[PDB]
Curated annotation (Swiss-Prot):
<comment type="function">
    <text>Responsible for the cleavages located at the N-terminus of the replicase polyprotein. Participates together with nsp4 in the assembly of virally-induced cytoplasmic double-membrane vesicles necessary for viral replication. Antagonizes innate immune induction of type I interferon by blocking the phosphorylation, dimerization and subsequent nuclear translocation of host IRF3. Also prevents host NF-kappa-B signaling. In addition, PL-PRO possesses a deubiquitinating/deISGylating activity and processes both 'Lys-48'- and 'Lys-63'-linked polyubiquitin chains from cellular substrates.</text>
</comment>
<feature type="domain" description="Macro 1">
    <location>
        <begin position="1"/>
        <end position="167"/>
    </location>
</feature>
<protein>
    <recommendedName>
        <fullName>Papain-like protease nsp3</fullName>
    </recommendedName>
</protein>
<comment type="subunit">
    <text>May form homohexamers. Interacts with N protein.</text>
</comment>
Length: 167
């Protein structure tokens, strides 16, 4: 038993809710919240900009130190940093950005990072301003992640479309 509430169960291990991931993280304080990161951990917009704003920019300060030490992530890769006031940990995962021409096949590699964590609160990778089809992202999630994932979908219209079209 965990504290996630109001989710629709899609499979044995994947759950989905129309929710603001920031507000959901603040209330659950999950062990892991996933950020929709880029390779530079520049949290300007989308989910990343919203999560970082909710940390009063502490996520960005920590991220800049991480990059200065380690260099950029790989597309499809991840790193574990602090969850600040939102979660114990933040798993920064880089899905491919279609608006940069990155290979969508890397989306599966991106979701594989979730398997290193027993339970996660997450957005759909490569959705929103990353330009991929969210229906496809959900399919890859279900077919790749084996650990327990609670997906927060901000847009109500998209949430309904994702549920109604789910096979």
């Amino acid at each position: 038993v965990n504290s996630f509430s109001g989710y629709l169960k899609l499979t044995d291990n994947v759950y989905i809710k129309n929710a603001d991931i920031v507000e959901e993280a603040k209330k659950v304080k999950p062990t892991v919240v996933v950020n929709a990161a880029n390779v530079y951990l520049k949290h300007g917009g989308g989910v990343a900009g919203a999560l970082n704003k909710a940390t009063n920019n502490a996520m960005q300060v920590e991220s800049d130190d991480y990059i200065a030490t380690n260099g950029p992530l790989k597309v499809g890769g991840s790193c574990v940093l602090s969850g600040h006031n939102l979660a114990k940990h933040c798993l920064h995962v880089v899905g491919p950005n279609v608006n940069k021409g990155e290979d969508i096949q890397l989306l599966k590699s991106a979701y594989e990072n979730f398997n290193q964590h027993e339970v996660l609160l997450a957005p759909l990778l490569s959705a929103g301003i990353f330009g991929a089809d969210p229906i496809h992202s959900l399919r890859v999630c279900v077919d790749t992640v084996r650990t327990n994932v609670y997906l927060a979908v901000f847009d109500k219209n998209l949430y309904d479309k994702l549920v109604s079209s789910f096979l």
